[PDB]
């Protein structure tokens, strides 16, 4: 067994990590005080779930997690909430004043004075690991902490753990749920500084999640609680192979091998089905065919875009529940004759399939219905570059007038870091269009 450390940065990263660790506990039957009645090796072990939990002599199962925020109120809600006993005080790190939606404030000014305490609390966890593989990093593109401190952290982690793998779960900015006009700036800055330090990055557009919540959960105006419980179901799908016995994606290196041939194009699109309101009076359960087919509707993606108009480089299907290979292969053969799925020429047209027989777990009292089978598709398609174009356009509208730049320069940043980051993004967009478009 090889351990994984989860790093949650800033408000979005902390609230999403809360949602995920709650889900993990339900799935592995770990109670809020950290007791796991079914773990019969008291005080130790190296089962699959120990990738994410350590054990104490008292039989307490402790997340391999560190929560970091430049301001205390969100992590204070962790310290006083339902899972207060779950975490050790030293794993919950807060500053005093936050980065004020300012990348440079979180990176240069306030980051510089807390980065060393964080790396030391992170080494405290690495030290209880027999063979650490690396890191799951949760953060928003748009917050000053989530962008600026996360990029500082990523650079330093490459320095202090240069062999380990680094995976990101990133919240892409959506105006419907954001109170900041500078999120495009922060997004570009942090993507530029983090790109080479990340092996695999799963982007979640708050706008897609918001509309899935309205459309399929009948929630009129979703809150962060609604968004996060859905996002955590998806994250759970993606990490179940690290936490459960199986043979697909069993360590972090395999996510890069299976999903990322070209290391800069490391942004798989996630699609999830079915999402069913728990208040839905009467529901006919969806078959393997119907949920697999739903994996190819844009309305079920984590990022609205159109994979019909790009090319695929890899595809993983991750099923939970009552599924067997014959149903999957029949569903694929049907879908292939009815949909525009084009792969890049130097890749096999094919699917890696993982089936875990336990159906998805839902938070009691949440919005999501229990279902008999569900699926998460991870596809590396060039169509996700659409989300970069959107973001880059917004950045270009503001930066042409230098709107808000002075807030960044006043933190130590140089104006030229803006156009550096922007030109890296332009390289990125051209990479995508080379791999995915014919003349």
């Amino acid at each position: 067994m090889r351990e994984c450390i989860s790093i949650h940065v800033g408000q979005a990263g902390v609230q999403i990590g809360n949602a995920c660790w709650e889900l993990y506990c339900l799935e592995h039957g770990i109670q809020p005080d950290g007791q796991m009645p079914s773990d019969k090796t008291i005080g130790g072990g190296d089962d699959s779930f120990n990738t994410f939990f350590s054990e104490t002599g008292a039989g307490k199962h402790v997340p391999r997690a560190v929560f970091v925020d430049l301001e205390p109120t969100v992590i204070d809600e962790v310290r006083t909430g339902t899972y207060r006993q779950l975490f050790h005080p030293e794993q919950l790190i807060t500053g005093k004043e936050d980065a004020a939606n300012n990348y440079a404030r979180g990176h240069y000014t306030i980051g510089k004075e807390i980065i060393d305490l964080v790396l030391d609390r992170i080494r405290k966890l690495a030290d209880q690991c027999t063979g650490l593989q690396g890191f799951l990093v949760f953060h928003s593109f748009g917050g000053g902490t989530g962008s600026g401190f996360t990029s500082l952290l990523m650079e330093r982690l490459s320095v202090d753990y240069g062999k380990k793998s680094k995976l990101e779960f990133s919240i892409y900015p959506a105006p419907q749920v954001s109170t900041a006009v500078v999120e495009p700036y922060n997004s570009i800055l942090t993507t530029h500084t983090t790109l080479e330090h990340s092996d695999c990055a799963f982007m979640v557009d708050n706008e897609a999640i918001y509309d899935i919540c309205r459309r399929n959960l009948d929630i009129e105006r979703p809150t962060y609680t609604n968004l996060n419980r859905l996002i955590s179901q998806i994250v759970s799908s993606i990490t179940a192979s690290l936490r459960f016995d199986g043979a697909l994606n069993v360590d972090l290196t395999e996510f890069q091998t299976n999903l990322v041939p070209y290391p800069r194009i490391h942004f798989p699109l996630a699609t999830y089905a079915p999402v069913i309101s728990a208040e839905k009076a009467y529901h006919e359960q969806l078959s393997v065919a119907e949920i697999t087919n739903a994996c190819f509707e844009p309305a079920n993606q984590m990022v609205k875009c159109d994979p019909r108009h790009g090319k695929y480089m890899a595809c993983c299907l991750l099923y939970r529940g009552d599924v067997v290979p014959k149903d999957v292969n029949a569903a694929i053969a049907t879908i292939k004759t009815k949909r525009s799925i084009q792969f890049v020429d130097w890749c096999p047209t094919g699917f890696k399939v993982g089936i875990n027989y336990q159906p998805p777990t839902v938070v009691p009292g949440g919005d999501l219905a229990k279902v008999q089978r569900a699926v998460c598709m991870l596809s590396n398609t060039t169509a996700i570059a659409e989300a970069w174009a959107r973001l880059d356009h917004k950045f270009d509208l503001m930066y042409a007038k230098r709107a808000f730049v002075h807030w960044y320069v006043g933190e130590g940043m140089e104006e030229g870091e803006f156009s550096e980051a922007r030109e890296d993004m332009a390289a990125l967009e051209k990479d995508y269009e080379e791999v995915g478009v014919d003349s």
Partner: protein, 425 residues
């Protein structure tokens, strides 16, 4: 980012500041003696932002009251909530400032300013996490204008990294004590342009017109004018004073509202416009009135400019779905008036606790290029006297040179140019 320090300077500054502490002490359940008395415990989750808590769990405003003569502060100490204020925080001289910016900034005010800063330093030192300052003052007199801007310069020296916000009453010939108000205002704006993060521009002209044409008051007093200012000040600060999803602080507003450091003069608005009726307002009605120029407090036509940013704060229990539809409707119907080069520059917030006497209300904070009309007016009134050097002897007799007037007028005309650049961009 938690405690805020409030300063009120001169006559207008203290009359409006007193009304502000009345209004928000009513919202937070605090009574004129400092004792809490409400129902919701959310009257006190963020009570520390504006109140220091003393022994007996008694709440004392983090308020410094400044004046160069004792008249208005003896009125405040006799006023409704006059006992609320920490008596050590009344700092006053005896001589007055004679509606003379030079006496407030350079002579009388200079004598007094260090003792004011001593009270500020003591209020800051007892703060876990001071986030910045607000100042209430007019720009047309001498104390609030001249000493008020002297204070701001001193506070920036000693706290260069805290947020500085002003609530600044603009002089108007229609509501006017003296002919030198355009001189005082121009000298003051030159200070405000450099040393504040946010300036809420309240035109006495606009308050007068609202009271007359909308509240149907034929003879508006300063008391009726200040009722509208304290209602707007309440709405503008409600997000900082009550728990909600936003977790509002000073800096994020400053960061997101101010795309260029000198263009930080905001147009405030309030809806529904009331005068101390029982009709329920709909969310579509709130949203239309909030954006109405007749509900705005700086006498500028938003249709003559372009919005750089917009904060809309709704108060009370209403549909978020309907608020977001109505908000999205005004932008998508009048999109030419929002600059296209700041994507998504209209942000909205909701506080579930409504103000006293209303079930639903909205506050508008606009960074519009039409605020240039305010500075043009002042500049025309200024130049009309300055080209004949009229009334200058009141200032040169305090040490000032004509050159200092010519520089302040040039800076204000520069700020008018800056605004006109982005109205055409």
């Amino acid at each position: 980012m938690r405690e805020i320090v409030h300063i009120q300077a001169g006559q207008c500054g203290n009359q409006i500041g007193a009304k502000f502490w009345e209004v928000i002490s009513d919202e937070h359940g605090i009574d004129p003696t400092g004792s809490y008395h409400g129902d919701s415990d959310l009257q006190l989750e963020r009570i520390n932002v504006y109140y220091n808590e003393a022994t007996g769990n008694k709440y004392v405003p983090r308020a410094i009251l400044v004046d160069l003569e004792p008249g208005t502060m003896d009125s405040v100490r006799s006023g409704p909530f006059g006992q609320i204020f920490r008596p050590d925080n009344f700092v006053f001289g005896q001589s007055g400032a004679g509606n003379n910016w030079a006496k407030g900034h350079y002579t009388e005010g200079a004598e007094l300013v260090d003792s004011v800063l001593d009270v500020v330093r003591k209020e800051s030192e007892s703060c876990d996490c001071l986030q910045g300052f607000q100042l209430t003052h007019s720009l047309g007199g001498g104390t609030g204008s001249g000493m008020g801007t002297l204070l701001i310069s001193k506070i920036r020296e000693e706290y260069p990294d805290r947020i500085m916000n002003t609530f600044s009453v603009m002089p108007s010939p229609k509501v006017s004590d003296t002919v030198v108000e355009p001189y005082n205002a121009t000298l003051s704006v030159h200070q405000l342009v450099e040393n504040t993060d946010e300036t809420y521009c309240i035109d006495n002209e606009a308050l007068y017109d609202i009271c007359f044409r909308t509240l149907k008051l034929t003879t508006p007093t300063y008391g009726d004018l200040n009722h509208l200012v304290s209602a707007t000040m309440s709405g503008v600060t409600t997000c900082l004073r009550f728990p909600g999803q936003l977790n509002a602080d000073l800096r994020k507003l400053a960061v997101n509202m101010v795309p260029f450091p000198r263009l930080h003069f905001f147009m405030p608005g309030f809806a529904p416009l009331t005068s101390r009726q029982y009709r329920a307002l709909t969310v579509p009605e709130l949203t239309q009135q909030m954006f109405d120029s007749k509900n705005m407090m700086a006498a500028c036509d938003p249709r003559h400019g372009r919005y750089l940013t917009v904060a809309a704060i709704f108060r009370g229990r209403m549909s978020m779905k309907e608020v977001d539809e109505q908000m999205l409707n005004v932008q998508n119907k009048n999109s030419s008036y929002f600059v296209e080069w700041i994507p998504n520059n209209v942000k909205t917030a909701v506080c579930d606790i409504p103000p006293r006497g209303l079930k639903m209300s909205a506050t508008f904070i606009g960074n519009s290029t039409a605020i240039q009309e305010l500075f043009k007016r002042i500049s025309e009134q200024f130049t009309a006297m300055f080209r004949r050097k009229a009334f200058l002897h009141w200032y040169t007799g305090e040490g000032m040179d004509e050159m200092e007037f010519t520089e302040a007028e040039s800076n204000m005309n520069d700020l008018v140019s800056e605004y006109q650049q982005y109205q055409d961009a």
